[PDB]
Design a protein around this ligand. Sequence first.
Ligand code: HEM
Ligand SMILES: O=C(O)c1ccccc1Nc1cccc(C(F)(F)F)c1
Length: 405
Amino acid sequence: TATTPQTTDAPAFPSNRSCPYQLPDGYAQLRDTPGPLHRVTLYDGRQAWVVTKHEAARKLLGDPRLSSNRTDDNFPATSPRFEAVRESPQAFIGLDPPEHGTRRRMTISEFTVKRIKGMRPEVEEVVHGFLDEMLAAGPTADLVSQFALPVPSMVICRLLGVPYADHEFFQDASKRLVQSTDAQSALTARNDLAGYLDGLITQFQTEPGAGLVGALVADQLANGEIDREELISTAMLLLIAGHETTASMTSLSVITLLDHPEQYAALRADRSLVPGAVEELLRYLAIADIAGGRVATADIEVEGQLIRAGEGVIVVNSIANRDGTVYEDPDALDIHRSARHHLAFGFGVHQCLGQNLARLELEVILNALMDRVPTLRLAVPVEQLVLRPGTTIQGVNELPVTWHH
Ligand code: HEM
Ligand SMILES: O=C(O)c1ccccc1Nc1cccc(C(F)(F)F)c1
């Protein structure tokens, strides 16, 4: 057996959070080490680079030599989930220019500032309805299942034209896919969603209807400009991202705000601070490092360090968002700071399609919680919560809460 010291210069990555709003201990070390890049070891023993500094992260996310192609043999997979989805065509999150733009542009019209503004009545109605329901159902609740997840689920389903009557099926399948720890469970969940979306497509060909899925069927599919299987993958990406991200931000924001009561009280007293507070929470909670993987198709020199063609690179936006040369006192939550330029949504051609929908949702959500349940508090200590591992979207699967009856 091993009898020598075990220190490594390529630590295992990713790490798991122990506190919902602080860097894992190993990540603070990466944050402090000079240089834009650091070697890490992935779950299968393969070495990859992580990007740990803010401007270097923007530069590399903007560099077309870093490909988003998940089918590449050298793509930096962080768990066995990745190996599962090989047979299926990728959604545009896994495409590079020029194919990336042709597919992304098929969906952008649903996310314009004008459409998002027009969605405010629906978002407010959905938020207040699930809130009406949770407050009436009992003195305590799981915020996740009763509020954080159904709200963005109903909103994105309406945008897509996915009937919410099937929500128990597709919400469960979405959870199994993003939180899968092995390839087989991931493949099963993906096939479940694919079969469901396939049936929805056939129905739109018979009976044209509203929503982005209906529009893609009636236009691009009918012109042969998207493959049926690509349409499934695109709808699946938007469905899952639209659900899982906002839900995680809601639950983690509640935990974080309750641990910072002075700032939460200031937020309640001046609602003009909400948009800025949402940006700070996005920066600080950075829930989507899982989306930072890239593979180099050519050598890239980064401040003296060399990324070789064929090497995997993960842009760790949570660490980059704690860069003190950009955010003074970066580990402090400050809803009054300028959190502009943060990387929680990425940067460049793949920058989050839904970012302004997410911003609208989180603004409406925080205002609604402060208006309708100002006495909201956790029903258990923070120590008793269970955080998801760094191999998935950050968050909590259950969040017990209570309030003044
Ligand atoms: C709520 C907080 C959210 C966070 C923190 C977040 C984070 C991210 C990040 C970091 C990326 C970049 C992936 C990459 O560079 O490979 C991304 C892309 C994307 N996100 Fe978001 N997201 C959020 C909400 C949403 C919502 C509500 C939707 C609605 C469907 C959405 C849809 C997408 C899509 C489609 C992409 C792929 C864009 C592309 O490849 O061109 N996201 N997101
Ligand atoms: O990344 C894929 O290929 C993907 C595929 C199908 C469904 C969802 C997918 N991605 C995903 C799932 C949840 C959250 C986010 C993101 F963080 F990027 F928004 C991306």
